[PDB]
Copies of this chain bind each other. A is one copy, B any other.
Amino acid sequence: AYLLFYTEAKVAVAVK
């Protein structure tokens, strides 16, 4: 898996 960044704006991180 890798770290997925996404914008909420502010940066947030998910794991895929």
Task: State how many copies of this chain the complex holds.
Answer: 12
A6-B6 contact given A11-B13, A12-B11, CB 8 Å threshold: no
Q: How far, in whole Å, are A7 and B3 apart by their CA atoms in the complex? A: 7
A1 surroundings in chain B (CB, below 8 A): 6-8, 10-11, 14-15
Overall SS of chain A's interface:
strand
A3 surroundings in chain B (CB, below 8 A): 3-7, 11-15
Q: How far, in whole Å, are A6 and B2 apart by their CA atoms in the complex? A: 4
Q: How far, in whole Å, are A15 and B16 apart by their CA atoms in the complex? A: 9
A13 surroundings in chain B (CB, below 8 A): 2-3, 11, 13-15
A4 surroundings in chain B (CB, below 8 A): 2-5, 9, 12
